[PDB]
Amino acid sequence: GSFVEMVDNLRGKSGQGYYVEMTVGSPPQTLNILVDTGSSNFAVGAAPHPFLHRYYQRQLSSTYRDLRKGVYVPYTQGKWEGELGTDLVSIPHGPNVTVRANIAAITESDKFFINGSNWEGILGLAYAEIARPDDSLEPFFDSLVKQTHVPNLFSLQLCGAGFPLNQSEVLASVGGSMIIGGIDHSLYTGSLWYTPIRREWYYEVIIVRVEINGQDLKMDCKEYNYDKSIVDSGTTNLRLPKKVFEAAVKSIKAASSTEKFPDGFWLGEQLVCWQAGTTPWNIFPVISLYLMGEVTNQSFRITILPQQYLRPVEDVATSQDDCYKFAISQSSTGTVMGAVIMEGFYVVFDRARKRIGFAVSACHVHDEFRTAAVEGPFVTLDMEDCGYNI
Ligand SMILES: COc1cccc(N2C[C@H]3C(=O)N(C)C(=N)N[C@@]3(c3cc(-c4cccc(C#N)c4)cs3)C2)n1
């Protein structure tokens, strides 16, 4: 590992998101910030809020600059509103540089800040095209690259614990690494396989085949990317298009049919529990997503285990049982490879070469019989047809 200063700089879990420490203003104001490859704004709480124990105080920063413009961001299941400006921003456990970046000072929000969550803002790492209010507001990473010599690439190792982490534990535990400007070889095993970034807005990719325990879901591959497929550290679950979700759940139920689970479990609403240590991992299937490779007619696959798609949750009776929620759910906005997918791999966002790399994560949860995997190559024809166009 050549980036020791950035290794283990993340904290959190899939259900609450993973965050990194950042500072804003002069003198520096420290804040915990959610790492989000699913958005492109750097936005931080800038006013008192019941669920925040600290926030950005613009009046105390000598380097604060008011852009005299507001921003309103309503998203499904939540929203935030704020005031735009710029200031000096740094990442203590990151590159040793300070950059002037845009900051959306959140003055009002709805279902944005979660009680128990330890972050006070979000770092949108995707492209300008989806920045709010529009693409003229340069994203943080673009500013970083333009103002310093930091390579146009970052990589993420999100580490799920495999069991519940209480309030004390989640604050005292290492949740992963965000390597800014490079690839740390200590974070993965095996080889890195790259899939092209289809278009630079979200980190869009193309899935060309899906298997449940080796059995081909056998759907027109266009269905897998309808209306798009993205890699999003800011989404907890692996989300699949309605029709794909229906087919996948049917296959996962069939593979695990030796035990019957309630509809609420499959809907991701209710937890299921087993006596301590007896979770029947082996009855659940592995899931393989084949992604377009960099070479013509070549693909590779990433395989996850139920240890990735069954999210550990504390039992309501805080018993000694091991409980989980099914972390695969349906979407009407395309496939979203969220945290439970990313927890199995070291993911390289190679913006410079317009590609995303995947390798087995050194911190993925597994058992003595199965492990997550990244394998290739496979001959796959007409992969462009798998991409959707409106
Ligand atoms: C910040 O600026 C902007 C701009 C436009 C949109 C935008 N966002 C759209 C939201 C969204 O719907 N997704 C999917 C996402 N990728 N990021 C957002 C949030 C995620 C969480 C959150 C909470 C808990 C856990 C996890 C996890 N894992 C994530 C809260 S808001 C921020 N942000």
Curated annotation (Swiss-Prot):
The active site is at 36, 232. One of its GO terms (cellular component) is synaptic vesicle. Its main location: membrane. It is found in: Cell membrane; Golgi apparatus, trans-Golgi network; Endoplasmic reticulum; Endosome. GO terms for molecular function: amyloid-beta binding; aspartic-type endopeptidase activity; beta-aspartyl-peptidase activity; endopeptidase activity; enzyme binding; peptidase activity; protein serine/threonine kinase binding. GO terms for biological process: amyloid fibril formation; amyloid precursor protein catabolic process; amyloid-beta formation; amyloid-beta metabolic process; cellular response to amyloid-beta; cellular response to copper ion; cellular response to manganese ion; detection of mechanical stimulus involved in sensory perception of pain. Expressed at high levels in the brain and pancreas. In the brain, expression is highest in the substantia nigra, locus coruleus and medulla oblongata. Its EC number is 3.4.23.46. Glycans are attached at residues 96, 115, 166, 297. N-Glycosylated. Addition of a bisecting N-acetylglucosamine by MGAT3 blocks lysosomal targeting, further degradation and is required for maintaining stability under stress conditions. Keywords: Acetylation, Aspartyl protease, Cell membrane, Cell projection, Cytoplasmic vesicle, Disulfide bond, Endoplasmic reticulum, Endosome, Glycoprotein, Golgi apparatus, Hydrolase, Isopeptide bond, Lipoprotein, Lysosome, Membrane, Palmitate, Phosphoprotein, Protease, Signal, Transmembrane, Transmembrane helix, Ubl conjugation, Zymogen. It is a single-pass type I membrane protein. Induction: Up-regulated by the Ca(2+)-regulated transcription factor NFATC4. It catalyses: Broad endopeptidase specificity. Cleaves Glu-Val-Asn-Leu-|-Asp-Ala-Glu-Phe in the Swedish variant of Alzheimer's amyloid precursor protein. Disulfide bonds join 159-363, 221-386, 273-323. Inhibited by RTN3 and RTN4. Residues 1-390 are extracellular. Responsible for the proteolytic processing of the amyloid precursor protein (APP). Cleaves at the N-terminus of the A-beta peptide sequence, between residues 671 and 672 of APP, leads to the generation and extracellular release of beta-cleaved soluble APP, and a corresponding cell-associated C-terminal fragment which is later released by gamma-secretase. Cleaves CHL1. Monomer. Interacts with RTN1; RTN2; RTN3 and RTN4; the interaction leads to inhibition of amyloid precursor protein processing. Interacts with SNX6. Interacts with PCSK9. Interacts with NAT8 and NAT8B. Interacts with BIN1. Interacts (via extracellular domain) with ADAM10 (via extracellular domain). Interacts with SORL1; this interaction may affect binding with APP and hence reduce APP cleavage. Interacts with NRDC AND NRG1. Belongs to the peptidase A1 family. This is Beta-secretase 1. It comes from Homo sapiens (Human). The gene is BACE1.
